[PDB]
Structure 1
Amino acid sequence: AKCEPSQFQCTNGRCITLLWKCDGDEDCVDGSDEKNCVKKTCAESDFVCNNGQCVPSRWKCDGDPDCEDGSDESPEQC
Structure 2
Amino acid sequence: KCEPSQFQCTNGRCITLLWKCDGDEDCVDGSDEKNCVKKTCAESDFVCNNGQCVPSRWKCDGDPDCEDGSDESPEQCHM
The TM-score with structure 2 as length reference comes to 0.43
In 2, distance between residues paired with 1:28 and 1:59?
Answer: 25
Q: Structure 2: where are the runs of 5+ without partners?
A: none
How much does 1:56 deviate?
A: 0.4
Change in Cα spacing, 1:16 to 1:76, as seen in structure 2 (3 Å) is farther
Query: Number of aligned pairs?
Result: 77
Instruction: Say which SS state the counterpart of residue 7 (structure 2) adopts.
Output: coil
| Greater share of strand | 2
Whether 1:54 and 2:22 are equivalent positions in the alignment is no
Per-residue CA shift, 1:15-45, capped at 9, x if unaligned?
9999999999999999999998535230341
Is 2:22–2:33's contact at 8 Å kept on the other side of the alignment?
Answer: no
Is 1:59–1:72's contact at 8 Å kept on the other side of the alignment?
Answer: yes
Instruction: Say which SS state the counterpart of residue 14 (structure 2) adopts.
Output: coil
Q: Which runs of 4+ in 1 moved over 3 A?
A: 2-37
Is 2:6–2:17's contact at 8 Å kept on the other side of the alignment?
Answer: yes
The 5 Å alignment of 1:15-54 reads 37-38=36-37, 40-54=39-53
The TM-score with structure 1 as length reference comes to 0.43
Q: Structure 1: where are the runs of 5+ without partners?
A: none
